[PDB]
Structure formats: C-alpha cells, structure tokens
C-alpha cells in the first residue's frame, strides 16, 4: 500500500515525522557532494569538478582514469592523480557528523557511501554502520589472484608521493587501492545488506550524489513505497520503487532541499533542536583530530 506518512512535503514535515514514534530506522545514501566542503572535488561540478580537470593526464577521455581495464593497461595517470589529490588532512564535514549523531541517537540503520575518503569511519561510524559501495583507499591489494598481498595506506602513500608505481614486493603484480573501479564488481556486503536493510527502513536520506552511478542509484527504488525520501543536494537528482517524484500531482513522499549538504543538515538539526549538540560534536571531534 502506497501510504502517506509525511504530513507535508517539506523539511519541517520530515522533521515532525522524524519526531514520530514510527521513525526508528534511517538509511543514508551519500556521494561526493558531502565531502566537497572537506576540499575533495566531486566529478560532475563545473570548472571545479574532476571531469573538467583531467585533460592534462592525456587520457582517451576523462572517465578512463577510473576504468578498471584502462587502469590495468596503464595505472600511471591514476597514481599521479592520487598524488595531486591526496589531502593534507582527513577532517569530516558537518554532514558527516550529522550521521554520527543519528548513530548516537539510535536512528542509524546504515550509511551506504560511494565515497572512498574514509571520512565516515573517521567521523565515528563503525564498520557495521557502513556499506562502502565503491570500496576504500585505506587498504590496497596486489592484483595477482593467487597472492593478494595486502599493503597499508602508508606503503601506498610512500609510493604515490615517490612517483613509483606500486608493485607487490613478492610477486611483482601491480598494487591497486581497494577501490571499485568502473567495470568492477561491487562488494558482497552491498547486495546482502540491501536485502536485509530496506525491509526495516522508515526514512531514506540522500545527500550529495547525482545518482548516475549504478547499481547504487537504484537503491532508492528498493525502499518500501511508503518510505519517505529526503534529498539534500545542490541540484535535484533521482528523477529519470520508482525514481524521485518531487513536484507532480502524484507526489506523496519525496522532498528535495536544494543547497549545501552542510546547510541542510544544520537546518534539520535545528528543527529537531539538535543544532547545539551537532555544533559541539563537530568542534570536539575536529579538535581531537587537530590534536594528532
């Protein structure tokens, strides 16, 4: 049954609903827009986006650098790019901490993330809270099936800053971050968690993704038809379970809030009377990081 649980298709609606006794189980879906404030570029933004900033790596086209088969025949563009992009400091955003607070308030069933920056773990989400849908830069493995030597971040970082292409110390096979390059299979966990999680979901909260990457994007339509969906994004996504209907005669459960993910989270914090708690969480945790 396509029931209605939002009183109004606004963020105040979503907040009241969040305050209802029914809303106990939240899933976050996130992408690259939630980390743009931490100085990590997204792909799709103009001038700043990565797809407008690769020309100087002499690729067949921009996308190729993140393609498993191109990376295999020529891994050098990628690792030179990794050195250009490698952050001076890994400091999660407000958006990140807004999900930490959900976890703390008992409301977070799962965060499904497309990012590889590890900011979620850093912000305090345990492994069990997370499905890293495009993998992680944190660990790396050699590509030989029969070897699969793990290597640490530091080893991988050494190599990157050295401009030495990582080779397994044992078998000499190329060493790849545990990222899921385009053309790769998504991790086992993704499909298994998606089977369990979407049958308990009271609210979908979608932030800083253009929802063009599959099969992450389709997660939206795995939600029960009655489950309200909030997007917090600069631009509307999810349109082309069913895609996001925000604005037509039939709209009943979807909201778009258009602006910065940081701004959105603070606004929702505010409606819940969370603003101070969230402000204090960011500060305490930011300083703990600066303390190292």
């Amino acid at each position: 049954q396509k029931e209605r649980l939002l009183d109004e298709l606004t963020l105040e609606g979503v907040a009241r609903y969040m305050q209802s006794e029914r809303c106990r189980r939240v899933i976050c879906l996130v992408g690259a827009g939630i980390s743009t404030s931490a100085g990590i570029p997204d792909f799709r933004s103009p001038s700043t986006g990565l797809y407008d900033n690769l020309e100087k790596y002499h690729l067949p086209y921009p996308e190729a650098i993140f393609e498993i088969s191109y990376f295999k025949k020529h891994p050098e563009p990628f690792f030179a790019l990794a050195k250009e992009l490698y952050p001076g400091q890994f400091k999660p955003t407000i958006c990140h901490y807004f999900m930490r607070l959900l976890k703390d308030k008992g409301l977070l069933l799962r965060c499904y993330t497309q990012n590889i920056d590890t900011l979620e773990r850093i912000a305090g989400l345990e492994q069990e809270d997370l499905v890293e849908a495009a993998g992680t830069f944190y660990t790396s493995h050699c590509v030989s099936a029969s070897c699969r030597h793990e290597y640490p971040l530091s080893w991988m970082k050494e190599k990157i800053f050295s401009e030495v292409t990582p080779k397994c110390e044992d078998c000499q096979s190329l060493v790849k971050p545990d990222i899921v390059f385009f053309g790769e299979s998504l991790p086992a966990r993704f499909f298994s968690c998606m089977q369990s999680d979407f049958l308990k979901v009271d609210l979908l909260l979608v932030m800083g993704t253009s929802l063009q990457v599959q099969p992450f994007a389709s997660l939206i339509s795995k939600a029960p038809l009655s489950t309200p969906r909030l997007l917090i994004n600069k631009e509307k996504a999810g349109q082309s379970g069913g895609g996001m209907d925000f604005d037509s005669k039939k709209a009943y459960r979807d909201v778009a809030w258009l602006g910065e993910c940081d701004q959105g989270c603070l606004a929702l914090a505010e409606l819940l009377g969370w603003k101070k708690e969230l402000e204090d969480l960011v500060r305490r945790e930011h300083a703990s990081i600066d303390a190292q």
């Binding site: 495009a134 053309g183 790769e184 299979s185 998504l186 499909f191 599959q214």
Partner: peptide, 6 residues
C-alpha cells in the same frame, strides 16, 4: 556480482 558503471 553486478558491476560499477555510469
């Protein structure tokens, strides 16, 4: 396992 693609 289905596959990362644009």
């Amino acid at each position: 396992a289905p596959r990362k693609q644009l």
